[PDB]
Design a protein around this ligand. Structure first.
Ligand SMILES: *[C@@H]1O[C@H](CO)[C@@H](O)[C@H](O)[C@H]1O[C@@H]1O[C@@H](C)[C@H](O)[C@@H](O)[C@H]1O
Ligand SMILES: *[C@@H]1O[C@H](CO)[C@@H](O)[C@H](O)[C@H]1O[C@@H]1O[C@@H](C)[C@H](O)[C@@H](O)[C@H]1O
Ligand SMILES: *[C@H]1C[C@](C)(N)[C@@H](O)[C@H](C)O1
Ligand SMILES: *[C@H]1C[C@](C)(N)[C@@H](O)[C@H](C)O1
Lengths: 7, 7
């Protein structure tokens, strides 16, 4: 909820 | 590249 990724 | 972030 306000960070990025991709997981 | 090919990863994401944000730093
Ligand atoms: C992710 O955030 C970046 C930087 O602000 C933005 O340029 C991208 O368009 C954004 O990606 C989209 O939204 C995310 C949630 C989806 O997983 C991705 O596939 C893309 O639609
Ligand atoms: C990824 O994030 C950068 C940096 O902020 C932004 O300038 C790019 O436009 C962003 O890439 C897009 O969104 C991702 C999720 C897609 O895989 C990529 O093809 C591109 O559309
Ligand atoms: C985001 C990019 C990635 C780490 N290369 C991919 O494996 C993941 C599913 O999406
Ligand atoms: C990506 C999002 C973030 C972690 N909130 C921000 O601090 C960074 C500069 O960009």
């Amino acid at each position: 909820x306000x960070n990025x990724x991709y997981x």
